[PDB]
């Protein structure tokens, strides 16, 4: 198992952010995806999205309410999510955690997401 995300993305504020994740494995069924957020300048992280067995599970982080959608396809080894109407409160590091049985405990990749003035 190997997990890729871009190192950085820049998103114009008010537009949709695409958090790309691609992985390699020998998929679907037991495989799961979690995404977490570390707000810039905090040392804590919020888990806010989880996907297994065709079902989306959403954490309660008010900045992400009504913004998070699954954009992946496990068969295509894509674990991406979209984030609507991105604003400066969404600046920080996004962390994708992919578990594929069998792997010992899974793998993670980080995106530093910079929201940028659309003006």
From Swiss-Prot:
The chain's coiled-coil residues are none
Annotated ranges, domain Ig-like V-type: 1-104
Please indicate the ranges of residues that lie on the Extracellular side.
1-119
Give the tissue specificity. Widely expressed with highest levels in heart, placenta, kidney and pancreas. Isoform 3 is relatively abundant in hematopoietic tissues and fetal liver. Isoform 1 and isoform 3 are expressed in CD14- PB monocytes and pre-B cell progenitors. Isoform 3 appears to be the major isoform in CD34- promyelocytic and promonocytic cells. During differentiation in monocytic cells, the expression level of isoform 3 decreases and that of isoform 1 increases. Isoform 1 is prominent in stromal cells and, to a lesser extent, in umbilical vein endothelial cells and erythroid progenitors.
Q: Which Cys-Cys disulphide bridges does the record give?
A: 21-96
- Modification after translation (UniProt): Phosphorylated on tyrosine residues upon stimulation with pervanadate and concanavalin-A (ConA). Dephosphorylated by PTPN11/SHP-2 (in vitro).
Q: Enumerate the subcellular locations listed in this protein's record, separating them with semicolons.
A: Membrane
Glycosylation site residues = 13, 91
Free-text note on domains in this protein's UniProt record: Contains 2 copies of a cytoplasmic motif that is referred to as the immunoreceptor tyrosine-based inhibitor motif (ITIM). This motif is involved in modulation of cellular responses. The phosphorylated ITIM motif can bind the SH2 domain of several SH2-containing phosphatases.
Q: What does it do?
A: Cell surface receptor, which is involved in signal transduction processes. Recruits PTPN11/SHP-2 to the cell membrane and is a putative substrate of PTPN11/SHP-2. Is a major receptor for concanavalin-A (ConA) and is involved in cellular signaling induced by ConA, which probably includes Src family tyrosine-protein kinases. Isoform 3 seems to have a dominant negative role; it blocks tyrosine phosphorylation of MPZL1 induced by ConA. Isoform 1, but not isoform 2 and isoform 3, may be involved in regulation of integrin-mediated cell motility.
- Sequence similarity: Belongs to the myelin P0 protein family.
* Subunit structure of this chain's protein: Interacts with phosphorylated PTPN11/SHP-2.
Listed name of the protein:
Myelin protein zero-like protein 1
Q: What is the lineage of its organism?
A: Eukaryota, Metazoa, Chordata, Craniata, Vertebrata
Name the encoding gene, please.
MPZL1
